Every structure is written in structure tokens, then in C-alpha cells.
């Protein structure tokens, strides 16, 4: 007859609200996860020039502004019909790797580590980064330093840490110099050591409470990712959706997304529900993010991340791990990959190059930019006129894809741990950790 | 005499009997806030930011239009003047819609610099949210009227310096607007030569050259070199701005010569477009 | 036992200002030894306690943010506005030229990739968008303004050290930026 | 007809060519004989007096007596 509301969900980005509806006998029958913010970036961007979009769109989120920057840059690039210099490609990929590193470090160390180290039943006042630096100071400063590495890469490339500006329509504005290149390269060993320490921590956490942590909000769905020929790619590539059992279903090209993805609207959330169109809703809904990426990708291109990708693949069947709480693990793998990817970019003598712009005089009516933000796939779609004025905007961001998975996981833990009324603050914390495993950027979702 | 002397900020300054106070101030080094003043154009008197008062006389005089007369003491900085100038800036911000986050001139705008120098951190006024037209019909120049101070330096540059009298003021009052010929968009106007003298004269980010947006900020350049435009025989003096091995902005030095700094479409479009070939 | 009671939140922000708070990397560790952080987007407190310094980010777009700003105002003595979204209104005010109905409709019905032949707009269990997005100096009384998008880490740290030393600071003109 | 107003305002600007002033009386008399100032009238006034279109539109929209659209 009554309701439980955890709003506002804490230690996540954005404004969320979990609502469980209990029946007369005191049992869970329905549970929802509402996103309670909206600004209208798809609407108030009309009439602006397209070259203005790589600066407006980063204001969607401050955890992943580089992702929106790069997607807008790609969309304007396809509006100009330019194919960017190899150097600009590498610098954009370096900035994307910095963003991946910083976002995963933030989402593991500052937002979810208390529930990994102290458990879901720790006191409330100590379950935060303050209590963490109080009791586990080395780990807190390690995560802080990793995020510093990522954001200082973003700063040396794009002037600022939050909302940087590096990517113009046509290419890239700045290049690295030998001094700052070596200054970045000399910092990679301790960052790899921090990533391996975190991987150790999460692996022991998952093996300790082994199987109960495998049923925590686990639901078999499809997995979407970006892939090169067969490899995990975060900047370019094709979109690949894998059925819940390994079979590849509709691997396509990013610009052909209106033929494959559709968004269903529900009255209780400003967040939409994207789904594969050929299977409808809510059957075509899939997962995005580190877990879905490592499930859809077949191999990786860096040694020490492959040595752990193998151990990750031998955790589930068919090269597929459906467990929600393994997201953390997968996330760290990506961070590791990111670091190693930087070590391949800094070693290329076209990072300190000078040919970075491909300027053209041509305005095409459509431009689509699809990249791999840390939490999943990010699609920008701009439609302009012949004057270069924005006529239509369409965004589909990462956490939005994971909305159905979050709802189902929250409902599962709701009618698994809620016994009746008088619910302690250890059952609500699990109702929030099922959301925190996906680490949602609720500002990205409701752009 | 043709040789007068004043005292601005206690500092004794020299000048000629024909000039204004702002000219005597700029002649030595002395600083006075200005937004509608442009070297090479007849003083207008619109922003009222150059206000200045003398000892004894409680009136406030616009330093850019009032002549200099030997024996007068000039005060540029005090509590009253700071308050009035901050109120003018807050009016300008609350009237129009200034979004510095994505402005192309968000680091080299005269209004923004005047607001930061006066420590503006609130507007104190109800923020009239009016709908102003953004004209991006011309592929090269953009006019975003959300950022207009109505200094008229664009209407004075296309009239006395260029001759292509394409710009003027529409309906009077608060509904004042800078229009093209007969209220048309810039692309429909036939009396435009696409010289960009208006973009160089605009102090805010209303008129903007589109293809070099966010790159042609004079504040984030690497070097400034002055040379001559090779394309034609006139040989206009330029002020090339270089950023990462690329020309991002070409501005016309020579606001004292009869050309007035207006360069042709070639001089300020092809030259920065040439460095990216 | 002599710790302050800083409590922060975001109303209609993009998390950018709180992420610029979080990049005070070593300054964060040496600040936590001088500040205990009650209700905040990075702690698990659900309701605002009685505090000393209250920090708000973002503007006012929903009917929930207004009440939350009023709560943070009543519960503190020194309020700090973070970012242009709270000080000037910021990018949210880009939707104050289109009616709320048109915003919601063209964002949930008219966009491509959207499939709802019913014509549903999100209108249940969630707060309703205000007719206009406004700064926080419309419903509360701000003490310290920190403009930017987002403010630099040095500015946030300066304001913190000044407020925890006992003086109400004003952002100096050599470090003020509207971005 | 849009062709009638051309010559009809030609005959109103005739007594004013090369007289250094008198533009608001021209507009006043085109308002008296048409009730409003159409775009064709303003274009022809600009072409006859060789005064820029921006100037004539600025002075036509400065005063409340004039009207740029047909009045009720
Ligand atoms: S014109 Fe100047 S004050 Fe106005 S938004 Fe642009 S940078 Fe800010
Ligand atoms: S481009 Fe030249 S002619 Fe056209 S409005 Fe600007 S200054 Fe006048
Ligand atoms: S467009 Fe620029 S120069 Fe012209 S009136 Fe407006 S602010 Fe002044
Ligand atoms: S700017 Fe134009 S007019 Fe001047 S010298 Fe160069 S080509 Fe000739
Ligand atoms: S001012 Fe900028 S960084 Fe701060 S909340 Fe608003 S959009 Fe985000
Ligand atoms: N992560 C993230 Fe933001 C989201 N979702 C992007 O891109
Ligand atoms: S600058 Fe002196 S009045 Fe405009
Ligand atoms: Ni995000």
C-alpha cells in the first residue's frame, strides 16, 4: 500500500531516485529508477552554427566532457566532408584515453570503493572518500594520482581540465612537445601499478564472496560495443551487438544507427530507453559499458591488458560475463588498456607533428559522430542547412542504454533483500550499488 | 597656445587645445574605460563608461567627447565612478543574453574584460530573457544580436570607412537593432562587399568571422607580426596573428590612414585560409 | 572536534563544478583534515544537517531544486555559489527562449530515434521543469559568488581557506573568469 | 499594384531630387497616399535619392507614425 524512496541516490553523478512500491503484505511488487533532471540540449541548440557545438555539448557533463567534445568534432568533420590527418587522429585518441583513465579512476575510487572495501553494511558517516583517506590513505592518494594523470593529459592537450577545447572541425588545435611528452611518459609505471593494485583488490573482493556476488542484479541481455577488425577500439570502429550467448547480432557502421536503434519513452523518467529495433521493447534492450565492451570485443591490442583480458574471459561462458558487479573489474581493465594505449601513442613521432588541420569549404546536411565514452556508446547526430546553421540535433548517450539493466537489477535486489518494512540502511545501499556498478552519468543521459 | 596641460589621476599630462580628455589620457599612457570608442572613428558617446569628474564640479563628463582645457583636474577612479560603471555593465548583461561559456570572443571581448576589471560577480537586475535573432545566413559572417552593446561602431565602419552603407539602426528605444538593407538578413543584402571591417570594429562577439571561430582569439596567440597584403597593389598594412603555425586572424593596421584598416575579402579571408593548404 | 561543516550540492549542473572541486588532489587530502563533509553529492547523507558553509552549484530548473536550495539556505550561515549556472544562470538559460512545453515535446516526441506514437512526455513521479531556468540568487541569498564554467581549483581552494579562516571573500579580479 | 507604387512615388520624389534634405516629408507623403510604407516604396525612394537602404529603413522605423505593414 505504501512506498520507499531512496532519493536522492548518492555517490552517483546526476539526480536519481529509486522508488520501491510495497504491497499490503510487505513485499516488493514494483521498483523504478527515475532520473529527475532535464535541460534540453537537443532543443536549445537550434539556430547555432555547427562550429559552436564542440563547445556547447561538453556542458552536458563534467565527468566526460572530452567524449562530447570528440563526438561533436567528428560530427562537424562529417559536415565538412574532411578526413582528418593521422596526427589529429592520434591526438584525439590520446585525449580520449586521458578521459577514460580519469573517469574510471573517479568511478572506482571516489564513488564505489567504500562499498568494495567496507561492505554494504558500513556506517554512513565513514562510507565516503573522506573516511577512505582517513583509514586507507595510500589507496585514496593512489586513485587521486591516477585521476591527476588523466586530467593533466587533458589539460596539456586542451588547456583546461573540465570542458577543454582541442578539436576543431577539420582536425586538432595543438600538439605535444618533447618535454611534456617525456613528462607524461615518465609517469606511466606508477599508474600501471595503481591499476594493477585496484585489479587485485577487486578480484579478491569478488572471489571472497564468490557466488552470491554473481547473482547480484544479474540479467542476461545483449552487449553493444565498438570494434575494429576484431579488436577493442574506443575512438573509431563499428558498432557490434552480441546476443546474450556470444553470437554477433547486427554489427553495423555508426552512421547507420537510425535503422537499428530506437528510443522508447516512459512517463516516470526523463531518461529514454534505447533498444535494437528489430527486437522491439523491452526485448531489444542491451548493455553498454566496460563489461559489454569486453564481451563484444574479441581481443585487445596491448600486452598487459591482454594478459588480464584472458583471465576476464575465463570467468564466463562463450567469452561473455553477464555479472553486473564484475563491471568494476572490466572497468579497471579498460583503465589499464588506456594507460598502455598512451604508451603506444607517445612513442609515435607524429604526436609532436605539425600537420593537424584539413580545412575545407563544403557543408553537408548531415553529420554523425559515434565514439566510446567510458560508460558506453555516445552518438551525436547533427542536421544543418546550407548556411551551416543547426536545424536538428539528436543525442544518444551511454548510461541511457543501461537504463533497463539498472531498472531490472534494482527490482531484483529489491525483491531479494527487502524482507518487509523496517528496512535498515544496508538494503538501501544495495539498491544504490546496483546503480553504482554501471556508474551512471545522469547528466549525460538526460542531456 | 595649441599646447595645454592637464592633471589626470594626479599625473600631469601634455596635449593640444583641440583634443578631448580621452585623447590626452591615451597620449601619455593613462587608462580610461572605453567600449564605444574606436581610434579612426568620430567619438560617438553611447556606453557612457568613459565618465570622469573634475574637482569641485560634481557633474560627470564623457572623457571621449569633452574637450581638454588647461588647468582642469581629472579624476578617473573613485567610489562613485566604480559604482556607476559597474551598474552600466550589469545593465548591459541583464538586458541582453551573454553566454560567455560558448562565445567565440570569450577571452578577447571588451565588455567581458570591463566586467572582470570591475569585479562583476552578479547582475543585480531581473535578467530580461528576450529573444534576439541570430543571423548565420551569410556563410562567412555571423551576427548574434544576443551580444549587442549597441555601440554602433559597425554602423560607423560600414558608412565612413567602407562606404557600403549596409548597416543601420532599426526601431528606436529598447527595441534598437542593427539591420542589413531593409531589415533583410546579411545574405540577402546586395550592398555588402564581405570586407569584415564590421567584425574588426565590433568590441563584443556579435559580428564574428565564422570559419576561424574559437581559434582567432588575440588572447591565445603565439606571435603578432605586421606585414603587407601581397594580393593587390593597394598594399594594406596588416597585423597577422599566428597560433600553432597558422594564421588565425588578419587585422588592418592603419586606422590613421584613409583606408581605415578595412581590408578586402581576400586580405582577411584568403591569407588565413592559405596557411591551412 | 573543531572541524567545519561544509555541505555541497548541485541543482541543475553538469557535475563540472564538483569535479573541479575534486581535482584539488593533494589539497583535498590536506583539506579533509580541516573540513568534515556532511550532506554532499559524494557522501551518503540523505538530508541536510545544520552546517557552517553551504555550497550550491547549478541553476534552478525544476521544482525540486528550488526547495533544495531553500533547505541549504536555511541550514547554513555562509552560502557559496559555484559556477556561472548558479551565479549568472549559465547554459541552462539557453532554454529560456523556448516555452517549456515546446522543449519537452520536441525533446521527447520530435527527436529522431524516438518511438512513441502515443505522444508521452515524462510527467509523473519526477519534478516539473520551471518555466525559466534562473540563477540561485532568485530564491536564496548568496554570500560568496564564484563565477566560471567551471571555476578553477585554485579559486575554490582560496574561497575555502578564506571562509574557514573567518572572513567572507570576494574572488579577486586577477583570478575571476567567466570562461 | 507593386508597379503602380513605383511611378507613383517617383512623382513624389521628383520635387525633392538634389535638394539636400526632405526625406521624412517624402515618407510622410507616401504614408498619406498609401496608409503604409511598403518595401517597394522604400527601395524606389533609396534608388531615386541615391540614399542607402539602411538609412531609409532606419528613419522609417524610427518614428511611430510610419508603418511598414498594411494597417487595419
Ligand atoms: S560578447 Fe563578450 S560578454 Fe558577451 S557572451 Fe561573448 S564574451 Fe561574454
Ligand atoms: S562585411 Fe564589410 S560591407 Fe558587409 S556589413 Fe561588414 S563592413 Fe559592411
Ligand atoms: S554589432 Fe558590435 S559594433 Fe555593432 S552595435 Fe552591436 S556591439 Fe556595437
Ligand atoms: S587587403 Fe585587399 S585591398 Fe588591401 S592590399 Fe590586400 S588585396 Fe589589396
Ligand atoms: S557553470 Fe559550467 S561547469 Fe558549472 S555547472 Fe554550469 S555547465 Fe557545469
Ligand atoms: N560515461 C559517460 Fe558520459 C555518459 N554516459 C559520455 O560519453
Ligand atoms: S566611451 Fe566615452 S562615452 Fe562611449
Ligand atoms: Ni557523463
Numbering used by the authors:
A (entry chain D): 4 to 450
B (entry chain A): 1 to 277
C (entry chain E): 1 to 179
D (entry chain C): 4 to 75
From the article:
To understand the electron transfer pathways in the NiFe-enzyme, we prepared cryo-EM grids in the presence of purified A. mobile Fd, FMN, and NADH. Fd was not resolved in the 3D map, perhaps because Fd binds only transiently. The structure is similar to that of the apo state, but the HydC Fd-like CTD and the HydB NTD, which were well resolved in the flavin-free apo state, became invisible in the high-resolution EM map. It is likely that the FMN and NADH binding caused a series of structural changes leading to the release of HydB NTD and HydC CTD from the main body of the structure and becoming flexible. FMN and NADH had well-defined densities in HydB and are stacked in parallel to each other in a configuration that resembles those in Nqo1 of complex I. Compared to the apo state, all the FMN/NAD-coordinating loops underwent substantial conformational changes to accommodate the two cofactors. The distance between the NAD nicotinamide C4 atom and the ionizable N5 atom in the FMN isoalloxazine ring is only 4.2 Å, well within the hydride transfer range. The FMN isoalloxazine ring is 6.0 Å from the B1 [4Fe-4S] cluster, providing an electron transfer path from FMN and the NiFe site via the chain of five clusters B1-A1-A2-A3-S1. Because it sits at the meeting point of the NiFe-S1-A3-A2-A1-B1 and B5-B4-B3-B2-C1 pathways, the single-flavin FMN must play, at least in part, the role of electron bifurcation. In the active state when both NAD and FMN are bound, we found that HydC CTD becomes mobile and interconverts between a bifurcation-ready BR state where electron transfer from FMN to the C1 [2Fe-2S] is permitted and a post-bifurcation PB state where electron transfer from C1 to B2 [2Fe-2S] is permitted.
